[PDB]
Design a protein around this ligand. Sequence first.
Ligand SMILES: [Mg+2]
Ligand SMILES: [Mg+2]
Ligand SMILES: [Mg+2]
Ligand SMILES: [Mg+2]
Ligand SMILES: [Mg+2]
Ligand SMILES: [Mg+2]
Ligand SMILES: [Mg+2]
Ligand SMILES: [Mg+2]
Ligand SMILES: [Mg+2]
Ligand SMILES: [Mg+2]
Ligand SMILES: [Mg+2]
Ligand SMILES: [Mg+2]
Ligand SMILES: [Mg+2]
Ligand SMILES: [Mg+2]
Ligand SMILES: [Mg+2]
Ligand SMILES: [Mg+2]
Ligand SMILES: [Mg+2]
Ligand SMILES: [Mg+2]
Ligand SMILES: [Mg+2]
Ligand SMILES: [Mg+2]
Ligand SMILES: [Mg+2]
Ligand SMILES: [Mg+2]
Ligand SMILES: [Mg+2]
Ligand SMILES: [Mg+2]
Ligand SMILES: [Mg+2]
Ligand SMILES: [Mg+2]
Ligand SMILES: [Mg+2]
Ligand SMILES: [Mg+2]
Ligand SMILES: [Mg+2]
Ligand SMILES: [Mg+2]
Ligand SMILES: [Mg+2]
Ligand SMILES: [Mg+2]
Ligand SMILES: [Zn+2]
Lengths: 159, 187, 103, 52
Amino acid sequence: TNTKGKRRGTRYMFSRPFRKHGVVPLATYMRIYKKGDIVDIKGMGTVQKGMPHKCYHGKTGRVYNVTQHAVGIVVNKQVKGKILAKRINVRIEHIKHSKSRDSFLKRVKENDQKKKEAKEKGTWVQLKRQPAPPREAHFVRTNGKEPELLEPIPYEFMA
Amino acid sequence: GVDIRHNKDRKVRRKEPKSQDIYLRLLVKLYRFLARRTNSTFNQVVLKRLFMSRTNRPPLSLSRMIRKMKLPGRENKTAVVVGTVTDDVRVQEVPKLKVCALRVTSRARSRILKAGGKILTFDQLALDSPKGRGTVLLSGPRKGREVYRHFGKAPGTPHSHTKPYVRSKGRKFERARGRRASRGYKN
Amino acid sequence: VNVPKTRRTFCKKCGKHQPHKVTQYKKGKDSLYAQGKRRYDRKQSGYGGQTKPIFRKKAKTTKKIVLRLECVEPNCRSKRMLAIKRCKHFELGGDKKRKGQVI
Amino acid sequence: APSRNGMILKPHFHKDWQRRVATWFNQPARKIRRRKARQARARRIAPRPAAG
RNA sequence: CUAACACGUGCGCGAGUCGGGGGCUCGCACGAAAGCCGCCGUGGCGCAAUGAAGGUGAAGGCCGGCG
RNA sequence: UAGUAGCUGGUUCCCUCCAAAGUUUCCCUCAGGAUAGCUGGCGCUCUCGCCCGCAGUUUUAUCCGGUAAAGCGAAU
RNA sequence: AGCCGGGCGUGGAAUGCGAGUGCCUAGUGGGCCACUUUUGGUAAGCAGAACUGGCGCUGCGGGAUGAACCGAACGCCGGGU
RNA sequence: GGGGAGUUUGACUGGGGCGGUACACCUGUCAAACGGUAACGCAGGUGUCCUAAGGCGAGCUCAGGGAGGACAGAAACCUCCCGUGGAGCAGAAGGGCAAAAGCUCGCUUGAUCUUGAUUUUCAGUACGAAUACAGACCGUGAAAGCGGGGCCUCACGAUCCUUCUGACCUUUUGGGUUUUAAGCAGGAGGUGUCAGAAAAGUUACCACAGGGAUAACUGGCUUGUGGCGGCCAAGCGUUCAUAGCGACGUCGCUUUUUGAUCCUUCGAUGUCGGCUCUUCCUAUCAUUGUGAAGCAGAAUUCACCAAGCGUUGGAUUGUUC
RNA sequence: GUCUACGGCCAUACCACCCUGAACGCGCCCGAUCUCGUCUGAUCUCGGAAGCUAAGCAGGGUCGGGCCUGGUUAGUACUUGGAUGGGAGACCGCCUGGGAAUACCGGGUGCUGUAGGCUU
Ligand SMILES: [Mg+2]
Ligand SMILES: [Mg+2]
Ligand SMILES: [Mg+2]
Ligand SMILES: [Mg+2]
Ligand SMILES: [Mg+2]
Ligand SMILES: [Mg+2]
Ligand SMILES: [Mg+2]
Ligand SMILES: [Mg+2]
Ligand SMILES: [Mg+2]
Ligand SMILES: [Mg+2]
Ligand SMILES: [Mg+2]
Ligand SMILES: [Mg+2]
Ligand SMILES: [Mg+2]
Ligand SMILES: [Mg+2]
Ligand SMILES: [Mg+2]
Ligand SMILES: [Mg+2]
Ligand SMILES: [Mg+2]
Ligand SMILES: [Mg+2]
Ligand SMILES: [Mg+2]
Ligand SMILES: [Mg+2]
Ligand SMILES: [Mg+2]
Ligand SMILES: [Mg+2]
Ligand SMILES: [Mg+2]
Ligand SMILES: [Mg+2]
Ligand SMILES: [Mg+2]
Ligand SMILES: [Mg+2]
Ligand SMILES: [Mg+2]
Ligand SMILES: [Mg+2]
Ligand SMILES: [Mg+2]
Ligand SMILES: [Mg+2]
Ligand SMILES: [Mg+2]
Ligand SMILES: [Mg+2]
Ligand SMILES: [Zn+2]
């Protein structure tokens, strides 16, 4: 059977990208994580302290505790037929703010603003994101040039 | 052929009391009629609770009843409980209450009558208030039974304050291996 | 491994870091009147032969050796047990090694 | 074998308990006999206290 | 089938509950039943837990009197 | 002494409804058990005749990867 | 960071559907087959895995025959397709 | 003190046994781009080592190469230049690392005391290992800081018993003092079959409950091996590739050899040969009819239709051969 | 236009050679009493201001290497789902969707934050 080592099969997952080894850029250290941010997990092999287990690599969780160097986050893990929301502590290098939430936040601010506006105007405005509707009817103008014929080319071997 | 599942097709709720006595069944007849020919849902709740079993109709204590009726806004309303009103001895001052219950302890009934309240039974309750206006529907603590201390997450498992099943309490009964860091492990 | 004979470390009684004299802990002589021993001879006496098991399948060639620490402060002189990882050869404060010499 | 959850029990029926069983089917007859003896002694000691 | 335990259900009473052992009932067809005891509740279970043990043992919140 | 048997054989009426597993971990464990998983029964708390949630699905965003392919005039 | 008090309902993608929760619990813990992926093997109706569906637990029309293939899953009947 | 008694004599497992450990662990792959994922699959490693190879701080830069300098050279030491790591970091492998995680010095013992939480296998239980904290005592540095072992992934052990350490600790039972003993908490002494019995064989004198979950026949699938047959045409055949052969290749057929497997049979299908007797196949030895020869005749080759009819008597061996 | 101090993103910023640098600045540079450290004031530390853009540094150049970004390769390779499709097989075609990577050919060669200067 296999081995139950903590880092089995991570030679590519925890490795560094090509031509990106060396000193960790300081912007990663200079970011602020508060209680309740949605955050992504991406193990970085450069630092070995507080490295998350390989099964949380690429997972997104919620911050619930902030500490000197690390952050505690609640993340869902599918174990057999059930999902457990378990909390793990990850050092700040292996973490990154999720941009999936800021889009929704900006949308909230923007449609709240356009709801506050036009409230006095009384006009109607659409807020829900409708799915891509079918294309409407239109005209395709030929400019006096007729469409050119397309025919299959004859078979002839290359190799 | 239809792509459906029949596991949860049949609902398990009670249609009628499992009991066989005749007085409760007469009450059930009356409240069945009331529930189906009145739009008030108090009758529906009362009939449903009449259907229930003994362990689902826990007794309500006098202290609980006075505590829940002393709350603001609910003065001079009738306290309705489908269970048994038992006396509480650790309460001296008892006000006058208008109680309705299936059965009341003798000492509790004496206490209420001495205090000046009146005891009602669900029949006379129907006559007084068919739709049940001015009623405070109470119930005893359902989780009061001691069997619930044995339920839930199993003992000998981290962060589980569940009572084990032991034939006798003492220092020689389930205290050594799983309960101490000194002997094996501590959960 | 090599361990020095003196170590400045925490002392429980003093509640502060103090110098400690360290030695190697060796098992004491088994008292004949321990409860377990007394029960053992009471059970073994008579007929029926051997009762408790005798271990034979030895497997480990080493053992964790324990350092007995003693606070050098004459008033305190408290003692504590400290153990570290297994080792085949072990010595106390011998031939402090130096680098870059003739092999 | 243990089931899911329950109490560990130590029934003391590992001997030949079925040979030494004390049924109490003579309890009413014993009570009747003790009574009869009681009244017989009470009559025997004519004016003396029955209790003793 | 007996005993033990767990849980679910039905009934009585309910911070209590239970005579199973004994006794009183002119012993005796049924009746070896049934009724009663209450200063026969000894006692069991419950009402308090925790600690190895010595042991300890289950709210407090506002104003006037020397922020 | 009706000795024990994780092993063979047998295990008695009808209809109705629901309906599996041969997988995880531990065991002198491998023809067996315990434990999760899968099943049934008993319920209970609410709900509609504005709104709550949920989904073996899609959409819109946003991250995660080193297989198929490809490369050796790029590292090994 | 926690507290209070106050104001905002166009319920902020599509589709579908009542949901949550608690006890007690039997049987099972020999599996097999197929498209695709795949390891050992010259290979096998061989041995070993992943996903899904089946057989086992399942009858029916077709493949003459048939545990698994194709269609389709079942109360007792009449008509139609 | 096998005269006699009681008992034991692991598991896995292409039958069992011998072999091996796939039995507790770790790296890469298998593994199908989350995770997980099998086989006695593949390549390997572990039961240690370290007073520093732990912890800080400072200063330097490695492997290799080129050009120079008495002995001196291919290689001894010095200097300059190039040098993205091609070196080193204890060990297997993988990841990671350049004013460092490497090399050299300075000072030290965070490898110390203590309560909780979390991750890894997972049942989401332990052990082991690890991660963030928190509370004291410290080390180092000017300091920010860093450090409660080794850059990360592995290097280890329940109950019962014994032993040591701790408190002006509790009990030692009618009261008191002192030895003793028992407790409470933390380490150590094991169980490598590594969630942990105290354990040698033989039976052809054997027994029981079972098993076609499993071997020894046949029969099935397979056809490597055996047997037989093709295509190509290097060469042999004095000359001439193909009268007759045919190298180096390559495609098949058969189940009269052996393997491989374990589907049927273990509440039994009588398990080698020979004797006797019948029938069938053709991949034809002879005979009938043919065609080709390196066929003058004779003899003998190769091929075709073809199984109608024949295919013996003996020595040796249980033999089939 | 540009520099210095501290930086963010870390080659569009690197590497090789060549040309030009007004002012400030950054440097090279001059010495070792003190602070400090070496075999050596070479480095480090300290005290200065005779000279110089020679070098570093900055800007620019190269049908430059590299790097970054496009086109081609290419709807090719591969691939989700489907068929009582083909083929003895090996494999291949089609339907429904997604869709690469070399060679080869183009373009570009650091943006920018805070504070403080020079261009009087
Ligand atoms: Mg139907
Ligand atoms: Mg059901
Ligand atoms: Mg003796
Ligand atoms: Mg069972
Ligand atoms: Mg049970
Ligand atoms: Mg029997
Ligand atoms: Mg068995
Ligand atoms: Mg069987
Ligand atoms: Mg891979
Ligand atoms: Mg490939
Ligand atoms: Mg198979
Ligand atoms: Mg089914
Ligand atoms: Mg079917
Ligand atoms: Mg057919
Ligand atoms: Mg029809
Ligand atoms: Mg013997
Ligand atoms: Mg995958
Ligand atoms: Mg350094
Ligand atoms: Mg600390
Ligand atoms: Mg180190
Ligand atoms: Mg013999
Ligand atoms: Mg078989
Ligand atoms: Mg020739
Ligand atoms: Mg026969
Ligand atoms: Mg026979
Ligand atoms: Mg022929
Ligand atoms: Mg100088
Ligand atoms: Mg210059
Ligand atoms: Mg110049
Ligand atoms: Mg170029
Ligand atoms: Mg700037
Ligand atoms: Mg001017
Ligand atoms: Zn001390």
